[PDB]
Amino acid sequence: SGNKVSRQSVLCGSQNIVLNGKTIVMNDCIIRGDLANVRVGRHCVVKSRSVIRPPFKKFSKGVAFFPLHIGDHVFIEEDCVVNAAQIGSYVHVGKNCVIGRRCVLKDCCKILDNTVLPPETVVPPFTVFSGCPGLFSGELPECTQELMIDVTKSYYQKFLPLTQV
Amino acid sequence: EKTAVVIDLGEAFTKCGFAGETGPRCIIPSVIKKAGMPKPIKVVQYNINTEELYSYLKEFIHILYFRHLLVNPRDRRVVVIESVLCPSHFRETLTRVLFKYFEVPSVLLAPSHLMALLTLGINSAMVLDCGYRESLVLPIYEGIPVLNCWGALPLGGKALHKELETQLLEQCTVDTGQSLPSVMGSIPEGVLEDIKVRTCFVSDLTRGLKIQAAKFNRPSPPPNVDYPLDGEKILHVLGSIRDSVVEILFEQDNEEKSVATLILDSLMQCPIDTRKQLAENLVIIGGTSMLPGFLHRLLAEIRYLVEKPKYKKTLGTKTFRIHTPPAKANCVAWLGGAIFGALQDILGSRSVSKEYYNQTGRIPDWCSL
Amino acid sequence: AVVCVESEIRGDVTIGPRTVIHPKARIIAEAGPIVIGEGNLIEEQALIINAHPDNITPDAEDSEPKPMIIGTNNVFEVGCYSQAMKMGDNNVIESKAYVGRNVILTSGCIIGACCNLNTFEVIPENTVIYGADCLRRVQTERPQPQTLQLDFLMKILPNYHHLKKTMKGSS
Ligand SMILES: Nc1ncnc2c1ncn2[C@@H]1O[C@H](COP(=O)(O)OP(=O)(O)O)[C@@H](O)[C@H]1O
């Protein structure tokens, strides 16, 4: 629970939640993603006005799609509807982006802004996905990912004292 | 050993291939669209700088074989395929990239027409070259190109798109998304070309005569064949405009310009020991001209112009054939050069090395050796 | 139907059976009586509208007196709104679909992601649009209004059925 300890927002889905350290997010978002199992991640990041959900049912023998997996030094952005996302560490989402069904990415997922993923959007490690559908545009440097993520975490923690609520 | 590279000079597409590769590999549009690029950069950019184009070539080739097969071309040879009329400075700039930047083992220029002949491997043949911007009838008698029998109509695929945009810019018979008649100016070239390329069936000669009648002082142009649109604006108008393109494709109206015209020109430079041979050799090829049902309009115009009074003396009564292509769409020269480069380890000596290019840096065409 | 307490409705909306409205299902059916269908699932963050008022100002003889309707198996997902969509049999609306005003949604309607519906466009049957390619009439028969896309909709409706009983039990 090393996030922004302040009266910011509320949500639900306490199935397999986790309040880890160095991982924080902003307000205006809702968390309704307990449709399948969960996997949170410390040192991550996210912006305001977002939404996330898991893949499908997974209650009966017909299990769901790839619902969720998070990582370290990750950085989500605004308006990113993370629907059915199982990714790794040092991920990077963009503005107005969305995750597609059965998306099973890996570490350092540079999700482009205003991009979305299609059904069964399993991505590889140290990649850079983009497009209306799931499309790995390029790649990403892992060292620069962890370094810039920590630098951004400190810079955001600097201005984090704003809105004492 | 190993494979090789098979790349030709295409304004629209320059595929790559290996040695003796049976079946196509990968086609990509010749223009280079990069990051933060508002409009991609072409290839036919002459009298332009060399460093910027040089760079574009470097990274484009780089990612080209990367996304093709991620191979290391510093290990195998290259089969360069030509397309005449291009400035040799450009070609040598490509070579400059290749050797002075990438250092491949050896490269080798080659004619596309050769590979076209290799599709059948016969000695004498006509050349029904129909490229992307021009055409060419430069026969290969005895497996040897016929020099002065040349000519080109600068009215290929690109100009066809220009014709399309002209016609449709004149009339926007589509709706809004109510008709939006010539409201905006820019066009979706991809959509336009999708309509065009996805609907290229050639019509009857009689229909072309109807078009000619419509030029001055019309019998049922629909059922018109033209492919759906987008942008909330789709329509079903006369697809007969593409047949109008087929009519303007061959103009005799104080122009006397056609493919048969170049065949006649060749005939003018042809000696008696070439005439009947070419009458046999009715070679059926052409790159961009993948025109469905063109046999009708084509053959009809051939056997329509045979009747020209100034050419019966030249022709007589010559019949022709159909030298059908065993290859496909445009893979003809591609796969022709692929199998042509297969066991040409012998000709690997003829493939220009970077070794000699160090002390040389030049490949001579018809110059002083 | 699952008349959720969190499902914010507004106005006279004579709903139909099996219209399970999920939590935070903000809607409006006052200026137009929107009747629900049979076999849908109104998810979270939706936005059902009725008779676009004078902010846009229809200065074209405003004498509407017309109510909205719905159909069977037409479950609309989260993010997407509903700007008086005259739906039908199995017209699913996926995430973030910008619903248009006059779009008579027929059967086999797969409203893809971020696909702003076309105003005053008769949405015919058996047509699934592409995401980035707006108005893509792709899959004219694969996305068939009956037995193919509607069968897939009824198949997706099974998870909605299990979720309907589960949400009725969880509440
Ligand atoms: N059915 C068809 N009829 C006519 N042209 C076609 C048809 N199908 C494809 N084509 C065109 O043939 C062209 C091949 O062009 P090409 O000769 O490869 O250009 P370049 O030589 O510059 O690469 C393609 O651009 C395509 O638009």
Swiss-Prot record, chain A:
InterPro entries to which the protein is assigned, alphabetical: DCTN5, Trimer_LpxA-like_sf
GO biological process terms on file: aorta development; coronary vasculature development; ventricular septum development
Principal cellular location given in the protein's record: cytoplasm
Domain of life: Eukaryota
Membership in a protein family: Belongs to the dynactin subunits 5/6 family. Dynactin subunit 5 subfamily.
Subcellular location: Cytoplasm, Cytoskeleton; Chromosome, Centromere, Kinetochore
Record-level GO cellular component terms: centrosome; cytoplasm; dynactin complex; kinetochore; nuclear membrane; nucleoplasm
Gene field: DCTN5
Swiss-Prot/TrEMBL keywords: Acetylation, Centromere, Chromosome, Cytoplasm, Cytoskeleton, Kinetochore
Protein name: Dynactin subunit 5
Role description: Part of the dynactin complex that activates the molecular motor dynein for ultra-processive transport along microtubules.
Subunit structure: Subunit of dynactin, a multiprotein complex part of a tripartite complex with dynein and a adapter, such as BICDL1, BICD2 or HOOK3. The dynactin complex is built around ACTR1A/ACTB filament and consists of an actin-related filament composed of a shoulder domain, a pointed end and a barbed end. Its length is defined by its flexible shoulder domain. The soulder is composed of 2 DCTN1 subunits, 4 DCTN2 and 2 DCTN3. The 4 DCNT2 (via N-terminus) bind the ACTR1A filament and act as molecular rulers to determine the length. The pointed end is important for binding dynein-dynactin cargo adapters.
Curated annotation (Swiss-Prot), chain B:
Keyword Transit peptide: no
Signal peptide: none
Assembly information from the UniProt record: Subunit of dynactin, a multiprotein complex part of a tripartite complex with dynein and a adapter, such as BICDL1, BICD2 or HOOK3. The dynactin complex is built around ACTR1A/ACTB filament and consists of an actin-related filament composed of a shoulder domain, a pointed end and a barbed end. Its length is defined by its flexible shoulder domain. The soulder is composed of 2 DCTN1 subunits, 4 DCTN2 and 2 DCTN3. The 4 DCNT2 (via N-terminus) bind the ACTR1A filament and act as molecular rulers to determine the length. The pointed end is important for binding dynein-dynactin cargo adapters.
GO biological process: retrograde axonal transport of mitochondrion
Tagged with keyword Cytoplasm: yes
Keywords: Cytoplasm, Cytoskeleton
Functional note: Part of the dynactin complex that activates the molecular motor dynein for ultra-processive transport along microtubules.
One cellular component term from this protein's GO annotations in UniProt: dynactin complex
Subcellular location(s) of the protein: Cytoplasm, Cytoskeleton
Gene assigned in the entry: ACTR10
InterPro entries assigned: Actin, ATPase_NBD
Family: Belongs to the actin family.
Protein known as: Actin-related protein 10
UniProtKB/Swiss-Prot annotation, chain C:
GO cellular component, as recorded: centrosome; cytoplasm; dynactin complex; kinetochore
One GO term of the biological process aspect: mitotic spindle organization
Keyword tags: Centromere, Chromosome, Cytoplasm, Cytoskeleton, Kinetochore, Phosphoprotein
Broad class of where this protein is predominantly found: cytoplasm
Compartment list: Cytoplasm, Cytoskeleton; Chromosome, Centromere, Kinetochore
Gene Ontology MF, one: dynein complex binding
InterPro entries listed in its UniProt record: DCTN6, Trimer_LpxA-like_sf
PANTHER family per UniProt: DYNACTIN 6, DYNACTIN SUBUNIT 6
Functional note: Part of the dynactin complex that activates the molecular motor dynein for ultra-processive transport along microtubules.
Family under the similarity heading: Belongs to the dynactin subunits 5/6 family. Dynactin subunit 6 subfamily.
Subunit structure: Subunit of dynactin, a multiprotein complex part of a tripartite complex with dynein and a adapter, such as BICDL1, BICD2 or HOOK3. The dynactin complex is built around ACTR1A/ACTB filament and consists of an actin-related filament composed of a shoulder domain, a pointed end and a barbed end. Its length is defined by its flexible shoulder domain. The soulder is composed of 2 DCTN1 subunits, 4 DCTN2 and 2 DCTN3. The 4 DCNT2 (via N-terminus) bind the ACTR1A filament and act as molecular rulers to determine the length. The pointed end is important for binding dynein-dynactin cargo adapters.
Name of the protein described by the UniProt record: Dynactin subunit 6
Classification of source organism: Eukaryota, Metazoa, Chordata, Craniata, Vertebrata
